């Protein structure tokens, strides 16, 4: 009788109904900045800002000042900021130190900044939960809050920006954050000068992480599969509902799958899916950054550092992949795009399934995100093509700064790389550490 | 003044039990009929846990009786739980075909409206590393407890049988504890998946779910308050996974409490060293030990010497080698009439007896094969009957009478064939295995 | 469920094996069984009776007790009887208990007197039970010639042996704590035993302690299996009395009652009438006046006490009179037991085929307020005792006439002259009503 197990998974997802008028796309980091400030000013009930980090720079200051200002003008407003515990406490003078100063320089005005530790050490888990919850809306982006993400000062970091007004969804997400994160073990205020040091809360974090391993949104679906819907998703570790949905989503492409990821480093299981689609005669588009649009890339004139080898390693991944699937490139089934715009940086994430599904997420679609980090998403089901104008405009602009790679040879090989890079990579591959690196970054 | 072993048993929580509410059955056919009878007359719930439920006449009989009872009483809570991996393959070496899970799907389609869910329990990511050896048919306020799975031979459909043990125990509290434990830990556990769903996942897709599930199971135990002292008839349900389970500890402590005699049934003689050490201590203390195992020919992997030999048909021989090695070392105790080893054999019927008798006072009924596999890898359970007043004596004795009826006593280890006496292909295979020391590995995984 | 079934459903119940319940059908068998169990006892013998008489029958039992204690000095032997009854003739035993103790030095068989009230007429020890190891041999019988059918004349009672560790423990332990170690219990084998007035205040405090002494134990058995529930009570609101009250309305088919002296309290009569109205059946088995132990043949010199059998007959006739309609519809059946000059002492209650109350309770106002009473309640929902239940009722009925009409019972006019005059005198001043509340 029934459909294949992949469509079944998606058909039976709980779905919240959504008005087309209540979904607003933004196409540029500057618009995103201004929208965030506007919504902070006009907020009436609550502001919940979850980000990887909020930087002690002009961009980040702008946001924190706007938060203090909104709380001053409406002291009944429920303002919370949640960032990664470990990231906020490292580069000299840290963000956490700055959050402390801010709280002292603004007495009476209550703007709590909580640090979420997803694991005992940064390398083993970070807060990749995304969402600015403002009243009945969620402004959802992969962006953290700093100069480049907000396009202060002339250089930018490209992300995606969607405002979704939806009482039920925002409640579900606000409430989930309240119970599981804010009131979770081992969450600790970063605006407290006496905040513990990581070792002191090590055991709290272990128990916290286990609590998170099966924390999921719980809500009843109110929408069928014939109408515009949104489905919030959250996950930590291999068997999360998010990861399962990402896995099942890809095979439902009857025509074409599109993927954005900053660092091309797909887990094997998602690669196998890609290859199956290509074999079934479908289309697959993959939009990644050029090595030079990576934020770790160091110009060849400057002093080379160890970390500036990452963009090269991601290129090697892309070139190996393309190499194996050049046949499908030639049939115009597989399309790989390299984004590049002077020395601006690329941070696009997401998944398009035909014209019907749009995953917006913080998920970099790499092994790290699949096991270690706390990830979330919104899954937009648009079976009636109501978002078609905006979907198409967004893809138009994403592609605008892209080259299509028509041949794996168009990508530089290790031989073409600078000498220090070349030596480093050969050393790494000798002892097989390249494989480990790709599982932790 | 009590030794640590008796202390362990004295302090076990125990549920009280009426002698009138314990019914033994002595033959696989009676067990079949009793199961069908209880399915018909069930009023509230039927929970069938088995290793497998086979797509054969015997298994069909049972599944049809389940559908029929649910049709006549739609409020009845019917569940079937079998091993995830076992349900999705043929028997070993036989021509891969339609699996049980495929059949469970057909059944559900051919009986719309009638809700008889069949769940697959994966105890580990691969069959060889954990199977569902939990046992129990929970029907209302009773548990019909056997080692038997549901197929032709276990149920003595069609003239050939597989000998197991069969006890019906009516006890509200115990059945509740077992029904509730299954509900929470298994049925609602991670990585349990319906086998009557045509779209059921494949093992690799749920691999991580199964890993987390197994860890949850590693310390899942019955929790209940004992209502009975050590002067009255009691039952104590036990469940375990892995070396330090409460079951395993109870089995370990149980054996030394034999003031007179310990009796053991196991299908495959392959005792872990720790249980062997206990046996030897009993023999040294001057006590008696009876061990009832199958002859090699009563093993279900045994292949008649006329037929084409296959690799798997070496297992009965390996179990015999284990028995012969054991007896060899303890021949002194055989001679003093302390150690008694029995070989069961009845034409080409097969032997699947499990359990432990401690004097006339304790009776462990279990699915536990008492081998290293059961000790570490599989999800095992039991009921421990404490009968300090000898109220079950008629039935206990009748059961042992009939078990022994098809047995030879082995008076000398030499009465067992040596490798030299075995068929040529067998002999060559075994010598090859022992050369590279794989015999030791085999005995820890089967 | 209605409140009556609910009461019974929620009673704590001890499980019981059908193999461990043995009925006996005749007083002689009961004697022999008692002696057998005394011989073979290994741990304890606790004999509670109204009295143990200084006659051949009673001697037999006391000698068997001394003998068993001689052969096993570690055996815990106790005898408990009524304090007041043991220290008088019929209308003393204690003196005899003293002699026995002196004639058997070294052998420790203590005889305790239990006073349930300061005067006999206001409370007697109607607790019943011979507790022997893990069994209770339960009868209404005291220990004397007729109860034990020594010497050719007998007193009909009921006899059940129930092997059950838990129940016997509960009963043995309850006796230990509440009676044996109770205030105002005193040894009757002591020549220097106090006189009632000296312990009067002890008895008052004792009685108050007894007013809410009840068995405390956890039920181990559901309502789908054979069970036993020990019950004990003193006074109107005891658990026993409540259970007797609730038991009767649970009869879906038929209620059977034995009582030696027909003198039901009004509340139990009202229940009976409700059953009859609901269309159910009620069987009542009592003694003929001549099977009463106070009955004096009409040739012999009449004495005041020999009026009691007549008063019980008047009660029966008044009851039947009011319910003759139900006699006619074959719902109400009244049986008179009579076997030459043997006497009748049957007590109990059958509810359908499912419940059997065995008790010392005469089901009269005295037993309801004044005396220390107990019982065992057998629940047999699976009809496992059906052979024995039916055999017992068969033999009980064997010496019975069915009363088909209240007029078949003699009226006061038909009674001997001295009786007739006495009764008319009593009813003139309304003392008949008082008598029925104290005997």
From Swiss-Prot, chain A:
Keywords from the UniProt entry: Cell inner membrane, Cell membrane, Cytoplasm, Lipid biosynthesis, Lipid metabolism, Membrane, Phospholipid biosynthesis, Phospholipid metabolism, Repeat, Transferase
Phenotypic effect of disruption: Shows growth dependency on divalent metal Mg(2+) and significantly reduces the levels of phosphatidylethanolamine.
Pathway: Phospholipid metabolism; phosphatidylethanolamine biosynthesis; phosphatidylethanolamine from CDP-diacylglycerol: step 1/2
Annotated PROSITE patterns: PLD
Reaction(s) catalysed (UniProt annotation): a CDP-1,2-diacyl-sn-glycerol + L-serine = a 1,2-diacyl-sn-glycero-3-phospho-L-serine + CMP + H(+)
Result, substituting residue 128 to A: Reduces the enzyme activity
GO cellular component assignments: cytoplasm; cytosol; plasma membrane
InterPro entries per record: PGS1, PLD-like_dom, PLipase_D/transphosphatidylase
One BP term from GO: cardiolipin biosynthetic process
Domain PLD phosphodiesterase: 23-214, 229-441
A single GO molecular function term of this UniProt record: phospholipid binding
Outcome of substituting residue 347 to A: Abolishes the enzyme activity
Assembly and binders: Multimeric. Interacts with ACP, YbgC and PlsB, forming altogether a complex at the inner membrane. Monomeric and dimeric; existing in equilibrium, but the monomer probably exhibits preferential membrane association.
Summary of the function given for this chain in its UniProt record: Catalyzes the conversion of cytidine diphosphate diacylglycerol (CDP-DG) and L-serine into phosphatidylserine. Essential for biosynthesis of phosphatidylethanolamine, one of the major membrane phospholipids. Phosphatidylserine is later converted into phosphatidylethanolamine via the action of phosphatidylserine decarboxylase psd. Associates with the bacterial membrane for its role, which depends on the levels of anionic phospholipids in the membrane.
Family: Belongs to the CDP-alcohol phosphatidyltransferase class-II family.
UniProt-recorded name of the protein: CDP-diacylglycerol--serine O-phosphatidyltransferase PssA
From Swiss-Prot, chain C:
Effect listed in the UniProt record for changing residue 261 to A: Reduces the enzyme activity
SMART domains on file: PLDc (SM00155)
EC number: 2.7.8.8
Membrane topology, from the record: Peripheral membrane protein
Effect of residue 434 to C: Increases enzyme dimer formation through disulfide linkage
Alphabetical UniProt keywords: Cell inner membrane, Cell membrane, Cytoplasm, Lipid biosynthesis, Lipid metabolism, Membrane, Phospholipid biosynthesis, Phospholipid metabolism, Repeat, Transferase
Disruption phenotype: Shows growth dependency on divalent metal Mg(2+) and significantly reduces the levels of phosphatidylethanolamine.
Domain PLD phosphodiesterase residue range list: 21-212, 227-439
One function term, GO molecular function aspect: phospholipid binding
Compartments in which it is found: Cytoplasm; Cell inner membrane
Family matches, as SUPFAM superfamilies: Phospholipase D/nuclease
Positions annotated as active site in the UniProt record: 126, 157, 345, 373
InterPro entries: PGS1, PLD-like_dom, PLipase_D/transphosphatidylase
Keyword Membrane: yes
Keyword Disulfide bond recorded: no
Domain of life, per lineage: Bacteria
Gene Ontology process terms (BP): cardiolipin biosynthetic process; phospholipid biosynthetic process
Pathway: Phospholipid metabolism; phosphatidylethanolamine biosynthesis; phosphatidylethanolamine from CDP-diacylglycerol: step 1/2
Any one GO cellular component localisation term in the record: cytoplasm
Effect of residue 128 to A: Abolishes the enzyme activity
Amino acids binding a CDP-1,2-diacyl-sn-glycerol: 50-51, 85, 88, 90-91, 120-121, 124, 126, 128, 140, 147, 155, 261, 293-294, 304-305, 308, 311-312, 347, 362, 366, 426, 435, 438-439
Effect annotated for changing residue 345 to A: Abolishes the enzyme activity
Catalytic activity: a CDP-1,2-diacyl-sn-glycerol + L-serine = a 1,2-diacyl-sn-glycero-3-phospho-L-serine + CMP + H(+)
PROSITE patterns for this protein: PLD
Oligomer status and interactors: Multimeric. Interacts with ACP, YbgC and PlsB, forming altogether a complex at the inner membrane. Monomeric and dimeric; existing in equilibrium, but the monomer probably exhibits preferential membrane association.
Record's protein name: CDP-diacylglycerol--serine O-phosphatidyltransferase PssA
Source species of the chain: Escherichia coli (strain K12)
């Amino acid at each position: 009788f029934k459909r294949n197990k992949h469509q079944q998974h998606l058909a039976q997802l709980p779905k919240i109904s959504q008005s087309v008028d209540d979904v607003d796309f933004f196409y540029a980091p500057a618009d995103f900045r201004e929208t965030l400030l506007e919504k902070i000013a006009s907020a009436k009930q609550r502001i919940c800002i979850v980000a990887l980090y909020l930087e002690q720079d002009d961009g980040g200051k702008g946001i924190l000042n706007a938060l203090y200002e909104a709380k001053r003008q409406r002291p009944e407003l429920d303002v919370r900021v949640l960032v990664d515990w470990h990231r906020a406490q490292r580069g000299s003078n840290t963000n956490a130190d700055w959050y402390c100063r801010m709280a002292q320089e603004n007495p009476g005005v209550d703007v709590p900044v909580y640090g979420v530790p997803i694991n005992t050490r940064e390398a083993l888990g970070v807060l990749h939960f995304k969402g600015f919850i403002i009243d009945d809306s969620v402004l959802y982006s992969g962006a953290s809050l700093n100069d480049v993400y907000l396009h202060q000062h002339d250089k930018y970091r490209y992300d995606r920006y969607h405002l979704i007004r939806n009482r039920k969804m925002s409640d579900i997400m606000f409430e989930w954050v309240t119970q599981n994160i804010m009131n979770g073990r081992g969450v600790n205020r970063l605006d407290d000068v006496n905040r513990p040091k990581s070792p002191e809360i090590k055991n709290d974090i272990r128990l916290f992480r286990q609590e998170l391993r099966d924390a999921a949104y719980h809500f009843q679906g109110d929408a069928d599969n014939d109408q515009l819907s949104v489905t919030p998703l959250v996950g930590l570790g291999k068997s999360s509902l998010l990861n399962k949905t990402i896995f099942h989503l890809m095979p439902c492409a009857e025509q074409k799958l599109t993927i954005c990821t900053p660092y091309f480093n797909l887990p094997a299981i998602l690669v196998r899916n890609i290859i199956q689609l290509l074999r079934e005669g479908k289309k697959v588009e993959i939009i990644v950054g050029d090595k030079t649009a990576n934020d770790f890339y160091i110009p060849e004139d400057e002093p080379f550092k160890i970390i500036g080898a990452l963009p090269y390693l991601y290129e090697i991944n892309l070139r190996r992949f393309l190499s194996r699937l050049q046949y499908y490139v030639n049939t115009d089934q597989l399309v790989v795009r390299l984004w590049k715009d002077d020395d601006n940086t690329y941070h696009l994430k997401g998944m398009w399934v035909d014209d019907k599904w749009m995953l917006i997420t913080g998920n970099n679609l790499n092994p790290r995100a699949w096991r270690l980090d706390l990830e979330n998403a919104i899954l937009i089901h648009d079976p009636q093509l109501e978002l078609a104008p905006q979907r198409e405009k967004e893809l138009e602009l994403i592609r605008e700064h892209t080259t299509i790679v028509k041949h794996y040879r168009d990508l530089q090989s290790i031989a073409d790389y600078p000498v220090k890079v070349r030596k480093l990579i050969r050393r790494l591959r000798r002892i097989r550490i390249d494989r480990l690196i790709s599982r932790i970054l």
